[PDB]
Amino acid sequence: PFSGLKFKQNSFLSTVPSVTNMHSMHFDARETFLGVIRKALEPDTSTPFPVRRAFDGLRAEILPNDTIKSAALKAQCSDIDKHPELKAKMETLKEVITHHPQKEKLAEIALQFAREAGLTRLKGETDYVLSNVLDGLIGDGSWRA
Numbered sequence: 001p002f003s004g005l006k007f008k009q010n011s012f013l014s015t016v017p018s019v020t021n022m023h024s025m026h027f028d029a030r031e032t033f034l035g036v037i038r039k040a041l042e043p044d045t046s047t048p049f050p051v052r053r054a055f056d057g058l059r060a061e062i063l064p065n066d067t068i069k070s071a072a073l074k075a076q077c078s079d080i081d082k083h084p085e086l087k088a089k090m091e092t093l094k095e096v097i098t099h100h101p102q103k104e105k106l107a108e109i110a111l112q113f114a115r116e117a118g119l120t121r122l123k124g125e126t127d128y129v130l131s132n133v134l135d136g137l138i139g140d141g142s143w144r145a
Helices: 029-040 049-062 067-077 084-098 103-117 128-137
Strands: none
Touching (some): 029 067, 029 103, 067 084, 084 128, 103 128
16 A cells, blocks of 8 residues: 555654653653654655655554544544544554564664553553554564563
């Protein structure tokens, strides 16, 4: 579906929080982590225009920066079977994530968020969107156990 999709190397680096930031009482691990992944999914300029436009729309809808929108999506996904369109979009994005050229680094960052900010503390009860992103990075889903 996204033929020719390439990503901008290190596009997410400046968005990765410091361990100190992760320890802040005001730090939102889930929203921040999804924001890091959204930045990592920035298309490389060599990506054909039609593809760039469609992919930007998908990553923005599934990983909104606005927290009110993010919360609204989370609520909808609690009954994901009622939203075929969102389900299709999540599965499509998860598939793209499994082939990310810097997936290894993104998974290490996810594990850092896990250890320093409790990102994966809900284990298998982790919400739909975050679970699919984490499974995209760590295929065996072992982050749950």
